[PDB]
Design an enzyme around this catalytic site. Structure first.
Site, PDB file in Angstrom:
ATOM      1  N   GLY C  56      79.262  66.453  57.016  1.00  0.00           N
ATOM      2  CA  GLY C  56      78.400  65.544  56.286  1.00  0.00           C
ATOM      3  C   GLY C  56      78.865  64.513  55.283  1.00  0.00           C
ATOM      4  N   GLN C  57      80.150  64.182  55.259  1.00  0.00           N
ATOM      5  CA  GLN C  57      80.615  63.183  54.302  1.00  0.00           C
ATOM      6  C   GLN C  57      79.820  61.919  54.604  1.00  0.00           C
ATOM      7  N   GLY C  58      79.482  61.150  53.574  1.00  0.00           N
ATOM      8  CA  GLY C  58      78.674  59.967  53.800  1.00  0.00           C
ATOM      9  C   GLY C  58      79.412  59.094  54.781  1.00  0.00           C
ATOM     10  N   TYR C  60      81.550  60.264  56.777  1.00  0.00           N
ATOM     11  CA  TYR C  60      81.549  61.124  57.960  1.00  0.00           C
ATOM     12  C   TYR C  60      80.213  61.621  58.537  1.00  0.00           C
ATOM     13  N   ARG C  61      79.099  61.499  57.817  1.00  0.00           N
ATOM     14  CA  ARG C  61      77.843  61.985  58.395  1.00  0.00           C
ATOM     15  C   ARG C  61      77.303  61.019  59.455  1.00  0.00           C
TER      16      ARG C  61
END
Lengths: 667, 133, 165, 55, 619, 63, 63
Positions: C56-58, C60-61
């Site tokens: 979920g990294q911004g 990475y999401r």
């Protein structure tokens, strides 16, 4: 910032102070409590329900309960002291110790340091070692609690004895080494950790006026570290404990009160306390502990309530499940259980009521007749295990309605405790209270308090103008002491040993001391007020029939009074114009016109108006005190000036202080 | 601690920084590392005045952070010292602050330091031909 | 067979549920990152169901926005220690379910909360009921029973989610 | 000034008493262009303060 | 719940003067009184309206249904003003001269125009969108609260009047339907059910009424300021929202009065009112404090304690199987003593003693109790309590006799209910009328309401007493209508003299008003004249102007005292006239009542005083 | 006059139109309406009402 | 191609954390700065930098 959910557990009978404990058991601990009928019990709260363990037989009222252990073993032996003897149970229903310790009345506090046993009494203090008397002390005032510093982290056993007269006598053997002074009568005290303080030894006390402290008792002197003197948190500390609930790494202070308030104090300043979470309970807390009892893995606080509701405050949420239209199911389970129980109990009690009516209950009221010092008003506090229906107040926070007729107070809905103020004048000695609970026979119990004809302190100032007064002739010292108990608020009933006693009183309405010294047949009642010695003369002459002036003292008392009357008159003068100025405030926004003088009132209008509500009582009290002072200071010379009062009333309506003192000295 | 600007001690480092602009250009309250807490643990700065700005860098460990003290050219930050080419300002030693506190550093913030203490200042006239301070 | 997808909030590290949500044969003691693409069989509150895992990294999401359309059954999760990084997880269902593939099939669609043994939380439902997002009604589920790492409550919205399959 | 009778203090613009621009039509106040037919009921604007009305 | 919105308004709100109205037609706003006699309007900025006069009522509703705007009503003890805030223009500015103590706005029965009902000294009124009197009737005492509720289920709402006489009457368009006798000056009524209405008193009692009975009632401290029925839990049935004198807002139920929702404030609660601020198409609930903070909302173990109380009772009964023989019976007796009180003696056919008695009655004793106290030297078996009710309404004492021995610390409390009849006093000018039959039934009426050709002669010089007797005997013999023949010479002549004084008071007030207006104009000119001297720095003439102003102010204050005393006397005379009308009509049951009232008013507008008295003499 | 003194133009205009309903072509009423419209400074209606005054009088000095 | 939490100050000093897709909060706290820094050691989204009239050094992480 901290949140604790109120999860309730088993309900036991009415409990005294510090009658709950937690067996140390990493999973859920076990709770042990003692009812006023002697039924000491313990449970574990496995899953929702209390799995009771060794619920014993009824006996005397359990006055104290403490768990300890002989060696450094995990302490598990639970000792109680019901009527006059100390019984002891293991961590199960096997009684092993029964020390009779034949005494007169009862036990009020006790401490178990391995084999050493320090018990209190009304006045007596004993230190036994395995049913063998080794130390015996007889204080002059009733004892509230006894503790002994850790005999392991230190070397000598130094028992501390908390007396009713605001002192902690840190005695060794059978004689006091020294006495620490504390504000308010101490009620609880316990070393403020699982060991007794890192830096050697530390004693943490809590008083009945509402005050905490950390007296560090060294070999010869105390080292005060901090104090938690409160303003809004009034209420007698009945219990205190140390436990790390916040989880920062240093143990926090879980402190109870007498008005339900449970408080957690964190030491985030690394040396001083700070409040973190407070919660009211509608009854009087009697014991507090940390740890966990339900759903191991979440630290919680266990709080013993006066009526017996052993409540917990957990750090774990309650809304475990949330699906569809929903309203959890444990609420439904508890609802169904209470439904069934109330049905069957209604059946039984209805049949028994029928039998009783066709064939046609004592209880406890924990009352507390204390004296507020910041004011001049006693604050009576009744408590009943059940709910009250109506309280009579006959004489000679509250949600109740007035009982005025002799005041009758009805208590709405389901309230246990009732706090009501009572303000009595410097004279007029002579108060009953009928309490009725919401039980079926609806009985009533009467209490008789006394409004004495002055809060006792430890020192006076002799450089004041003392208007001494001497009583002489044919006294038994016990009888003269009985007179002084009839005449003074806070004095022990039992005549103190030595046939020579001195007390240092102090008027709370305005600071004027009343040193009282007396021997087997003589008495000196020095004072700073003419009113006090006049009242003493009259009341002591009355007791007898039953069975000097410093010419500047009046000046001193009038100089004492002057600021109060000045403040009352300024109060009236400002509140007269508050509303008139407020009518001008609503227009033109007050940018350029209002005088700064009245601008100083436009802000504090609220406080002025809320003090004006109480002003007239203070003004009437001041006028009465001044007229009594005048009448008495003329009565000592042998005159009767009961007629010049109206001129004095007019002068006070004017209140020219210099003309006032002139009228005092002249006529 | 009373800032006018802030900084970032580590452009890619587990730390932080700050800047101090109190009274008369003293920039010696520069909070420091252990950036889990970024506490009162503050690196020793001997800067002459306030670093009216700050910056960072990449090829060095944010040493290139600049102390733009008023009246003086910025300075790359290297713990207790500077790194300046030909218009960026000089070292930590307060060139203006030192004269006031070089000769006449007699007493505390009171007229009994200079105006009522003219003993250690009528003997020392070290900051020569007083212009800057 | 019946898969399960979970995403999580940014800047948390709150992805360590699937290990303790897996069986007892291969339990993992390290923190389990929500890398996604996980392949395993785990006995759930209805049967031995399957799973899927995402990060979920911004930045990475969006790989979770690359596997969002599919899944036999479904999955709900959130970060209930987030007082600022839970505004952004509000749109995440509109990224997940608002998409046409998710809406078309009546399988399992619920979002649950987390971090209960952590010192902050909110309503049990959290994703579909606390943060004003009660309007997930046409989605054929509801989600509940959350703790932090100790391993509780995966059978909490199970009648709405797990035993609903 | 010294007599207040209007109920609303700040009523909507268009419902209270309290065209060509000043580049064409002469004016008497900030606005209020000069009128024809002076009548002794004309107020033609109002002062703000007693001082302004006097001076 | 959680307050869906909050805000702080810097103006003190007068307690019972709050309303929500869509003054822009579609934009709801708040109207609320304030100090200095100004009414402020909160739009979603606060806008002031200079009433320049102490407000006493305030509402807002639809007064002309042709347009969709709410009309802001403002009542004053001598005026009534409808206001279209949008296009600022008076709908009607009527002068009542009876006062505005409580107003409503709605549709009465068989009236096709929403009336702005009002309540003053003793007379109600009604006005349409232009201000025409369409409804007028007289009541017992000062009206304190009015609401519109359809008692009787016929689709046209009757109005419920709360008199200062402690009564709640229900009035149709012309006829009176019923009257329930509460126990203190009513302060607020609110209907939202069919025939159920929630009421408040000045004791602190908040309660609920069906047609002619109370569902529940709760008495507390901090008497309620504003009650309003809303649907907080949205269960489809409204609940009594209440705002108390301390700040507590407790949304209760219209079933047995169980608190459902609760909130608190910093000051007292001025008003709780519904209105959709946030424009969500659904009503809200706004709570407005006295200190000016507004907050708006959108719509567990005690039983174990009861179980423990039951177990404690069982413990008591098992202990059985300060003690007293179990066959101790408390027996009462009522009587009346002249040499001036209704005595109630309580005794016990044993050697036991009555340590204290705590009678509890609502409106008889000051407070709710009258604890009788006997000193320890005075204790005996039988104890007498003297009672002196203030009015003739049947009351029900709940005696609680503390029974026990002499030297006891705990003793029983025997409960006992005894009803003082309506005419508990009157130990054993005329109005005449006929009764149906059964002189024996008249004996029954006299024996059940007194502590002792078919024409009844009542020879009471008091008129309220004869009215009470006639109405009670009518309600007793099941009589609908009746006409009387009454003579009250010494009272009628006094009313005549009051009527004579009325016009003289009017003229004096007019003269003083003209004089004070002239002096006020002088003072304004002087203020302006004085200001000019100060500006031009002519200090002598400035001091002269201020001396003139001082003298005019002293003259004006003297005139103010005179006018104030005259106005008080005139208001007393008006209330006397209206009480005379109401006591004349009150003497007749059913329709023969209404007629008199109408005629009486039509006999005052024409100054036909002799015919007026003939209307109140024979009817 | 009374309504204009209380700063209520829109009440005075309604009253004037009521009067014109009573007196169908009065010149003083139309002139008062026009005066009120000019005080409110919307000339586009004051000209219309002065034109009505003209249609009635045609010697009116004001209009 | 990317932007995480991009906060802002306010004149009345309200924290206004802005998510890439949505707003976060609007507060009533003390004042703000010219520059701050997300110096998170332990992966916080928030800056934890404080500036105040009083000089407070904040670290909160909420035709």
């Amino acid at each position: 910032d901290l949140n604790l959910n109120r999860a309730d557990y088993l309900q036991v009978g009415v409990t005294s102070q510090k009658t709950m404990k937690l067996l140390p058991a990493r999973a859920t601990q076990k709770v042990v409590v003692g009812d006023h009928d002697g039924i000491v019990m313990c449970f574990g709260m496995k899953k929702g329900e209390a799995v009771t363990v060794f619920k014993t037989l009824p006996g005397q009222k359990i006055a104290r309960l403490e768990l300890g252990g002989a060696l450094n073993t995990p302490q598990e032996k639970i000792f109680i002291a019901a009527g006059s003897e100390i019984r002891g149970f293991t961590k199960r229903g096997k009684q092993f110790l029964s020390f009779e310790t034949n005494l007169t009345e009862s036990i009020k506090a006790m401490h178990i340091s391995g084999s050493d046993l320090f018990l209190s009494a009304s006045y007596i203090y004993n230190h036994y070692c395995d049913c063998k008397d080794q130390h015996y002390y007889l204080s002059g005032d009733k004892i509230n609690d006894v503790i002994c510093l850790p005999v392991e982290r230190l070397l000598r056993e130094v028992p501390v004895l908390a007396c009713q007269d605001r002192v902690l006598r840190v005695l060794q053997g059978s004689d006091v080494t020294y006495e620490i002074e504390v504000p308010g009568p101490p009620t609880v005290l316990a070393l403020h950790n699982g060991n007794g303080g890192d830096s050697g030894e530390d004693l943490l006390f809590g008083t009945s006026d509402g005050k905490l402290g950390l007296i560090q008792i060294t070999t010869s002197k105390p080292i005060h570290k901090w104090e938690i003197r409160n303003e809004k948190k009034r209420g007698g500390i009945l219990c205190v404990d140390s436990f790390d609930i916040v989880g920062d790494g240093v143990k926090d202070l879980l402190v109870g009160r007498d008005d339900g308030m449970v408080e957690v104090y964190g030491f985030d300043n690394a040396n001083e306390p700070v409040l973190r979470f407070d919660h009211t309970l509608s009854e009087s807390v009697t014991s507090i502990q940390g740890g966990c009892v339900g759903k191991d893995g979440y630290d919680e606080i266990v709080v013993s309530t006066y009526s017996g509701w052993i409540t917990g405050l957990t750090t774990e949420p309650v809304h475990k499940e949330s699906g569809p239209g929903e309203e959890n199911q444990e609420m439904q389970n508890k609802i169904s259980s209470l439904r069934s129980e109330l049905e069957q109990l209604q059946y039984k009690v209805l049949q028994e009521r029928e039998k009783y009516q066709q064939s046609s209950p004592s209880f406890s009221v924990n009352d507390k007749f204390t004296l507020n010092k910041d004011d001049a008003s006693y604050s009576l506090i009744l408590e009943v295990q059940t709910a009250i229906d109506n309280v009579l107040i006959q004489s000679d926070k509250n949600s109740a309605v007035v009982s005025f007729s002799l005041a009758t107070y009805r208590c709405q809905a389901n309230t246990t405790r009732l706090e009501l103020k009572i303000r009595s004048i410097e004279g007029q000695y002579g108060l009953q209270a009928y309490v009725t609970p919401r039980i079926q026979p609806k009985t009533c119990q009467v209490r008789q308090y006394h409004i004495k004809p002055h809060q006792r302190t430890h020192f006076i100032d002799h450089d004041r103008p003392m208007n001494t007064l001497t009583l002489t002739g044919q006294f038994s010292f016990s009888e003269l002491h009985s007179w002084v108990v009839f005449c003074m608020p806070e004095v022990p009933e039992k005549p103190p040993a030595g046939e020579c006693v001195t007390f240092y009183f102090q008027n709370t309405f305005l600071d004027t001391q009343l040193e009282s010294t007396y021997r087997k047949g003589e008495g000196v009642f020095k004072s700073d007020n003419i009113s006090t010695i006049s009242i003493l003369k009259d009341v002591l002459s009355k007791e007898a029939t039953k069975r000097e002036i410093n010419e500047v003292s009046v000046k001193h008392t009038l100089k004492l009074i002057h600021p109060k009357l000045e403040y009352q008159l300024l109060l009236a003068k400002k509140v007269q114009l508050i509303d008139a100025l407020k009518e001008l405030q609503v227009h033109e926004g007050n940018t350029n016109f209002l005088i700064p003088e009245y601008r100083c009132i436009l802000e504090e209008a609220d406080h002025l108006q809320e003090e004006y509500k109480k002003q007239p009582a203070h003004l009437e009290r001041l006028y009465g005190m001044i007229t009594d002072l005048f009448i008495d200071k003329f009565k000592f010379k042998g005159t009767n000036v009961k007629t010049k009062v109206p001129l004095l009333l007019e002068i006070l309506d004017s209140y020219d202080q210099n003309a006032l003192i002139a009228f005092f000295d002249a006529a | 601690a009373c800032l006018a600007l802030a900084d970032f001690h580590g452009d890619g480092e587990y730390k932080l920084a700050m800047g101090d602009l109190g009274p008369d250009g003293r920039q010696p309250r520069l909070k420091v590392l252990k950036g889990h807490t970024l506490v009162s643990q503050k690196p020793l700065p001997d800067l002459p005045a306030a670093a009216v700005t700050f910056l960072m860098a990449s090829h060095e460990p944010r040493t290139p952070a600049l102390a733009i003290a008023s009246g003086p050219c910025v300075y790359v930050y290297k713990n207790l010292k500077p790194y300046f080419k030909f218009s960026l300002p000089s070292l930590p030693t307060n060139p203006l602050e030192q004269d006031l506190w070089n000769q006449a550093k007699e007493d505390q913030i009171d007229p009994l330091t200079l105006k009522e203490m003219l003993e250690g200042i009528r003997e020392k006239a070290e900051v020569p031909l007083s212009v800057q301070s | 067979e019946v898969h399960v997808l979970c995403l999580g909030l940014d800047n948390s590290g709150k992805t360590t549920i699937i290990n303790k949500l897996k069986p007892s044969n291969a339990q993992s003691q390290d923190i389990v990152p929500t890398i996604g693409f996980s392949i395993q069989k785990f006995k759930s509150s209805s049967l031995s169901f399957t799973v899927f895992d995402m990060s979920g990294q911004g930045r990475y999401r969006n790989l979770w926005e690359h596997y969002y359309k599919e899944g036999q059954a479904i999955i709900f999760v959130i970060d209930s220690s987030d007082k600022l990084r839970m505004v952004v997880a509000k749109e995440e269902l509109r990224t997940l379910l608002n998409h046409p593939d998710i809406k078309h099939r009546r399988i399992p669609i619920l979002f649950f909360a987390n971090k209960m043994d952590l010192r902050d939380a909110l309503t049990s439902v959290k994703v579909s009921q606390l943060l004003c997002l009660e309007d997930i009604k046409d989605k054929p589920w509801h989600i509940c029973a959350s703790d932090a790492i100790k391993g509780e409550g995966l059978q909490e919205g199970v009648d709405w989610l797990q035993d609903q399959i | 000034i010294l007599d207040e009778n209007a109920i609303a203090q700040v009523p909507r613009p268009g419902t209270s008493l309290k065209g060509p621009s000043p580049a064409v039509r002469p004016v008497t106040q900030a606005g209020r262009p000069i009128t024809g037919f002076l009548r002794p009921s004309t107020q033609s604007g109002r002062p703000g303060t007693i001082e302004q009305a006097i001076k | 719940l959680q307050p869906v919105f909050t805000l702080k308004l810097r103006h003190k709100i007068s307690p019972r003067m709050v309303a929500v109205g869509r003054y822009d037609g579609t934009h709801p706003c708040l109207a609320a009184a304030t100090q200095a006699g100004k009414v402020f309007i909160h739009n979603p900025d606060v806008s002031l309206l200079n009433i320049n006069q102490t407000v006493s009522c305030l509402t807002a509703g639809v007064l002309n249904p042709e347009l969709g705007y709410d009309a802001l009503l403002v009542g004053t003890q001598t005026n009534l003003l409808a206001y279209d805030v949008y296009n600022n223009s008076d709908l009607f500015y009527r002068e009542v001269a009876d006062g505005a103590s409580a107003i409503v706005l709605g549709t009465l029965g068989d009236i096709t125009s929403p009336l702005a009902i009002i309540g003053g000294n003793c007379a109600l009124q009604g006005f349409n969108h232009e201000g025409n009197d369409l409804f007028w009737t007289v009541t017992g005492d000062n009206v304190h609260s009015l609401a519109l509720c359809d008692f009787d289920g016929d689709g046209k709402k009757e109005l419920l009047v709360g008199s200062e006489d402690f009564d709640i009457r229900v009035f149709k368009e012309d006829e009176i339907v019923a009257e329930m006798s509460e126990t203190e000056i009513i302060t607020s009524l609110c209907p939202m059910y069919g025939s159920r209405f929630g009421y408040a008193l000045s004791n602190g009692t908040v309660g609920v009424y069906d047609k002619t009975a109370r569902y529940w009632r709760i008495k507390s401290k901090n008497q309620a300021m504003s009650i309003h029925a809303f649907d907080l839990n949205s269960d489809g049935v409204c609940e009594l929202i209440t705002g108390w004198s301390n700040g507590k807002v407790d949304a209760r139920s219209d079933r047995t009065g169980e608190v459902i929702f609760k909130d608190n404030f910093s000051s007292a609660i001025a008003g709780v009112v519904e209105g959709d601020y946030r424009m969500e198409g659904c009503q809200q609930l706004i709570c407005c404090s006295v200190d000016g903070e507004i907050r708006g909302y959108l719509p567990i173990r005690e039983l174990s304690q009861k179980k423990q109380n039951l177990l404690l009772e069982l413990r008591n009964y098992e202990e059985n199987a300060g003690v007293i023989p179990a066959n101790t019976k408390h027996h009462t007796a009522l009587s009346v003593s002249l040499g001036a009180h209704a005595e109630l003696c309580i005794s016990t056919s044993n050697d036991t003693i009555i340590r204290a008695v705590l009678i509890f009655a609502e409106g008889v004793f000051a407070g709710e109790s009258h604890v009788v106290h006997p000193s320890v030297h005075h204790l005996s078996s039988s104890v007498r309590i003297p009672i002196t009710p203030p009015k003739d309404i049947p009351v029900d004492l709940h005696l609680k006799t503390f029974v026990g021995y002499r030297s006891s610390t705990q003793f029983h409390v025997f409960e006992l209910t005894r009803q003082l009849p309506r005419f508990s006093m009157y130990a054993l000018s005329y109005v005449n009328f006929i009764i149906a039959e059964r002189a024996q039934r008249v004996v029954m009426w006299l024996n059940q309401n007194f502590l002792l050709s078919g024409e009844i002669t009542v020879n009471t010089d008091d008129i309220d007493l004869a009215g009470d007797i006639i109405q009670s005997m009518a309600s007793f013999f099941a009589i609908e209508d009746l006409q009387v023949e009454a003579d009250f010479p010494v009272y009628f002549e006094e009313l005549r003299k009051v009527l004579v004084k009325v016009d003289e008071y009017h003229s004096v007030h007019q003269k003083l008003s003209a004089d004070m207006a002239d002096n006020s104009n002088l003072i304004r000119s002087l203020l302006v004249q004085a200001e000019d001297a100060r500006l031009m720095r002519d200090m002598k003439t400035m001091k002269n102007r201020y001396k003139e102003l001082y003298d005019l102010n002293k003259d004006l204050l003297n005139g103010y005292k005179i006018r104030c005393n005259n106005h008080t006397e005139l208001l007393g005379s008006l209330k006397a006239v209206n009480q005379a009308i109401q006591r004349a009509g009150h003497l007749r049951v059913g329709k023969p009542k209404n007629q008199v009232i109408t005629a009486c008013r039509d006999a005052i507008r024409s100054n036909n005083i002799n015919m007026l008295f003939r209307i109140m003499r024979v009817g | 006059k009374v309504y204009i003194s209380l700063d209520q133009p829109l009440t005075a205009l309604n009253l004037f139109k009521q009067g014109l309903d009573k007196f169908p072509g009065e010149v003083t009423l139309l002139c008062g309406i026009a005066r009120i419209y000019e005080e409110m400074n919307n000339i586009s209606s004051a000209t219309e009402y002065y034109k009505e005054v003209l249609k009635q009088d045609n010697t009116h000095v004001e209009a | 191609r990317g932007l995480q939490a991009v906060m802002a100050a306010l004149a009345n000093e309200e924290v206004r954390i802005y998510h890439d897709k949505v707003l976060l909060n609007v507060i009533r706290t003390p004042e703000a700065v010219t520059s701050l820094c997300f110096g998170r050691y332990g992966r916080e989204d928030n800056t934890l930098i404080m500036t105040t009239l009083g000089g407070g050094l904040i670290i909160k992480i909420l035709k």
